[PDB]
Amino acid sequence: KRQVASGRAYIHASYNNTIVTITDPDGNPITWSSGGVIGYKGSRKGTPYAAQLAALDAAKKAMAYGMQSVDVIVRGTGAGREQAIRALQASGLQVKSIVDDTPVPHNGCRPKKKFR
Amino acid sequence: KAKVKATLGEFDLRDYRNVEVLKRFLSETGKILPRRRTGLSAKEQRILAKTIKRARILGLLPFTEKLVRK
Amino acid sequence: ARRRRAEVRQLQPDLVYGDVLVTAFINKIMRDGKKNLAARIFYDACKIIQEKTGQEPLKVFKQAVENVKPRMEVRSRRVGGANYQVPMEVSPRRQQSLALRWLVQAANQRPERRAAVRIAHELMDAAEGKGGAVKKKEDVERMAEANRAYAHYRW
RNA sequence: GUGGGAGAGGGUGGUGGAAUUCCCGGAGUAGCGGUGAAAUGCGCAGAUACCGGGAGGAACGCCGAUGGCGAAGGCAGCCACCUGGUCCACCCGUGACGCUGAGGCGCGAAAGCGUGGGGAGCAAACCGGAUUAGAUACCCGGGUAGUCCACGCCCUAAACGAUGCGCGCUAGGUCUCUGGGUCUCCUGGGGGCCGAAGCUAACGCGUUAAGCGCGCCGCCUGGGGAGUACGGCCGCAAGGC
Ligand SMILES: [Mg+2]
Ligand SMILES: [Mg+2]
Ligand SMILES: [Mg+2]
Ligand SMILES: [Mg+2]
Ligand SMILES: [Mg+2]
Ligand SMILES: [Mg+2]
Ligand SMILES: [Mg+2]
Ligand SMILES: [Mg+2]
Ligand SMILES: [Mg+2]
Ligand SMILES: [Mg+2]
Ligand SMILES: [Mg+2]
Ligand SMILES: [Mg+2]
Ligand SMILES: [Mg+2]
Ligand SMILES: [Mg+2]
Ligand SMILES: [Mg+2]
Ligand SMILES: [Mg+2]
Ligand SMILES: [Mg+2]
Ligand SMILES: [Mg+2]
Ligand SMILES: [Mg+2]
Ligand SMILES: [Mg+2]
Ligand SMILES: [Mg+2]
Ligand SMILES: [Mg+2]
Ligand SMILES: [Mg+2]
Ligand SMILES: [Mg+2]
Ligand SMILES: [Mg+2]
Ligand SMILES: [Mg+2]
Ligand SMILES: [Mg+2]
Ligand SMILES: [Mg+2]
Ligand SMILES: [Mg+2]
Ligand SMILES: [Mg+2]
Ligand SMILES: [Mg+2]
Ligand SMILES: [Mg+2]
Ligand SMILES: [Mg+2]
Ligand SMILES: [Mg+2]
Ligand SMILES: [Mg+2]
Numbered sequence: 398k399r400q401v402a403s404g405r406a407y408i409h410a411s412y413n414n415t416i417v418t419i420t421d422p423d424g425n426p427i428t429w430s431s432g433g434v435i436g437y438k439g440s441r442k443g444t445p446y447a448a449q450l451a452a453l454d455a456a457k458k459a460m461a462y463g464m465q466s467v468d469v470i471v472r473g474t475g476a477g478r479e480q481a482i483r484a485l486q487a488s489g490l491q492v493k494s495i496v497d498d499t500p501v502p503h504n505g506c507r508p509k510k511k512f513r
Numbered sequence: 514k515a516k517v518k519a520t521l522g523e524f525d526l527r528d529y530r531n532v533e534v535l536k537r538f539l540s541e542t543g544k545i546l547p548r549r550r551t552g553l554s555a556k557e558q559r560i561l562a563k564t565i566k567r568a569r570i571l572g573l574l575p576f577t578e579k580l581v582r583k
Numbered sequence: 584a585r586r587r588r589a590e591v592r593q594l595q596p597d598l599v600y601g602d603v604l605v606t607a608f609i610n611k612i613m614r615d616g617k618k619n620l621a622a623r624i625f626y627d628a629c630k631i632i633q634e635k636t637g638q639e640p641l642k643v644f645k646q647a648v649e650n651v652k653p654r655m656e657v658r659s660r661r662v663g664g665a666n667y668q669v670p671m672e673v674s675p676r677r678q679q680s681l682a683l684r685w686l687v688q689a690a691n692q693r694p695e696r697r698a699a700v701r702i703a704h705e706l707m708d709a710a711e712g713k714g715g716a717v718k719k720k721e722d723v724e725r726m727a728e729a730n731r732a733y734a735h736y737r738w
Numbered sequence: 739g740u741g742g743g744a745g746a747g748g749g750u751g752g753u754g755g756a757a758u759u760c761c762c763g764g765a766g767u768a769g770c771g772g773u774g775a776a777a778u779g780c781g782c783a784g785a786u787a788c789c790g791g792g793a794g795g796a797a798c799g800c801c802g803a804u805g806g807c808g809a810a811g812g813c814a815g816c817c818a819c820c821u822g823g824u825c826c827a828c829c830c831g832u833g834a835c836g837c838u839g840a841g842g843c844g845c846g847a848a849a850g851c852g853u854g855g856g857g858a859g860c861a862a863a864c865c866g867g868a869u870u871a872g873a874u875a876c877c878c879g880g881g882u883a884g885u886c887c888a889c890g891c892c893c894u895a896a897a898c899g900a901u902g903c904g905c906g907c908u909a910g911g912u913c914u915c916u917g918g919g920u921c922u923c924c925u926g927g928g929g930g931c932c933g934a935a936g937c938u939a940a941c942g943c944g945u946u947a948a949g950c951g952c953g954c955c956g957c958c959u960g961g962g963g964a965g966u967a968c969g970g971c972c973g974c975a976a977g978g979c
Contacts, residue, residue, distance in 0.1 A: 407787070407788060409786095409787060409788095413771070413772060414770075416770090416786075418787045420765085420787090421765085421788095421789095423790095425765040426765060426766045428766080428767085429767075429786090429787060429788085431769075431786085431787080433768080433769055433771095434767090439773080439775070440773065440775070441732070444732055446731070446732040494582075497579070497583035500756075501756075501757075502758075502798090502799070503757070503798055503815080504756090504797055504798050504815095505758070505796070505859085506757060506758045506796075506797070506858075506859045506860080507758095507796080507859055507860045507861090510860085510861085538801095543800075544800035545800050545801040546800085546801080547801075548803090555803090555805075555914090556744080556915095556916085559744095559801085562800090563801095565800095566815065567817085569755075569815090570754050570816055570817085576754085576756070663774055663775095665775095
């Protein structure tokens with residue numbers, strides 16, 4: 398009910414999960430998916446296969462919205478951070494460009510004990 | 514690979530307003546290039562870093578950028 | 584095989600066909616060192632399989648063994664706690680061995696009274712695309728395509 | 739003295755972007771988070787993810803080094819102001835004005851104390867979830883003091899180069915920071931690495947001495963008891979000498 402025909406795709410990948418949000422050229426989201434949206438529940442959500450399935454599910458929902466041309470934004474690092482982009486390439490969506498916009502601070506906040 | 518100073522003129526390392534030449538010393542991202550790729554001495558690099566930060570605060574040089582093709 | 588490659592034994596050819604797979608299958612049928620009785624089993628089964636269906640037992644044997652050979656399987660790999668079932672492809676030599684073993688084991692798990700009858704009907708069913716050996720093969724293949732989520736643990 | 743130089747040296751005020759959190763709004767469904775697995779937890783009062791806007795605190799990515807500065811503790815965005823130390827060249831001035839230093843005085847990471855502010859993130863205590871034979875721990879989710887600032891205390895440390903300060907003498911080689919020079923190089927002054935002689939119980943040190951000498955200060959005399967007791971002094975207390 399939108400007929401967007403073009404937009405962005407943000408891939409947020411971590412070591413516990415990978416999620417894909419397909420949005421429009423001025424930032425508002427259209428659809429999304431993740432390792433928990435699909436069957437997997439626990440650490441299974443962090444596998445590259447779950448990332449591939451999440452990317453494919455989000456891409457098919459975008460097809461339902463009528464998406465053809467997609468720009469890719471990538472934030473984070475984890476298993477399947479690349480598999481998501483590979484499935485997104487071979488999903489049937491013409492990939493416009495891939496961009497890694499992983500937010501990194503300028504040494505602002507103190508991390509948790511795990512991260513020091 | 515070519516170092517920045519090797520392909521450049523007799524330019525001012527203390528000019529924070531010349532974006533044309535200061536852009537050469539930034540990376541694909543907004544990061545300052547190391548001495549391995551700038552071919553500068555320690556003193557030259559130390560002056561270049563401060564001039565780059567000066568230009569950044571004046572909105573002439575990017576504080577950070579986005580990586581492509583990743 | 585810590586040092587060497589464990590060079591494969593080259594079986595003797597067969598006296599009836601001249602083919603090596605027949606000798607390998609006859610060995611797989613043999614028990615307690617009776618290759619004579621096993622050969623008689625296989626060749627009475629050859630006569631029965633050539634009579635009950637008017638085809639050559641050569642190509643039916645070959646097509647059955649070809650139908651039973653699987654293309655993927657699972658091996659257990661110890662990673663981060665308890666091990667996982669990781670799928671992978673199969674060697675041609677191991678495909679041959681597994682096909683013949685499943686053939687014999689599904690033939691002797693049949694109801695038929697005589698051994699040769701079991702062998703013949705098992706070969707027939709396997710050559711048609713059905714039977715117990717092909718069922719075990721397709722279960723092996725169903726292990727693949729199922730735990731394929733571990734496709735990054737190939738090793 | 740003159741003339742140049744390098745620097746996260748200190749203080750004060752200003753100021754920039756990234757990121758976290760929170761709030762407002764848009765769009766958008768069903769989970770997010772987390773782990774070796776999980777669960778507590780959060781989510782239909784609309785979360786997570788995405789976009790725009792706002793608020794606030796704290797810390798300064800790349801440059802960055804095996805680098806620099808400081809007497810030590812220690813000191814990293816940028817700008818301005820106030821200010822310390824230091825190095826080199828000139829061979830100009832004073833004319834032994836020097837070295838060390840019991841006491842004293844000042845400084846002194848973190849944590850801690852008092853009064854008043856501040857509070858994002860982190861986080862003793864604590865509240866829960868797991869794990870385990872038990873879990874008072876490691877792992878997960880929360881969370882106070884605190885961490886931050888002003889002022890006044892506290893005087894400890896693996897406060898380490900486990901090497902007190904100063905001066906002279908005793909092969910070089912190699913990397914480096916910063917000056918001067920007639921600038922394959924030389925000559926000072928710092929930071930490393932090999933290694934002469936020599937030293938050392940050995941490891942190792944070796945012009946940045948643990949070598950050869952001189953001056954002065956501090957300290958040592960088997961281990962436990964014990965940095966405890968008593969006494970004194972200091973401290974709001976903790977406690978310190
Ligand atoms: Mg997870
Ligand atoms: Mg400074
Ligand atoms: Mg300062
Ligand atoms: Mg909202
Ligand atoms: Mg709820
Ligand atoms: Mg609930
Ligand atoms: Mg509720
Ligand atoms: Mg607030
Ligand atoms: Mg660094
Ligand atoms: Mg000064
Ligand atoms: Mg004179
Ligand atoms: Mg005179
Ligand atoms: Mg003195
Ligand atoms: Mg004294
Ligand atoms: Mg103190
Ligand atoms: Mg403190
Ligand atoms: Mg306080
Ligand atoms: Mg926390
Ligand atoms: Mg905690
Ligand atoms: Mg318990
Ligand atoms: Mg001495
Ligand atoms: Mg020079
Ligand atoms: Mg020094
Ligand atoms: Mg030197
Ligand atoms: Mg010697
Ligand atoms: Mg040495
Ligand atoms: Mg000496
Ligand atoms: Mg000694
Ligand atoms: Mg003593
Ligand atoms: Mg004693
Ligand atoms: Mg004590
Ligand atoms: Mg006494
Ligand atoms: Mg006392
Ligand atoms: Mg008292
Ligand atoms: Mg004590």
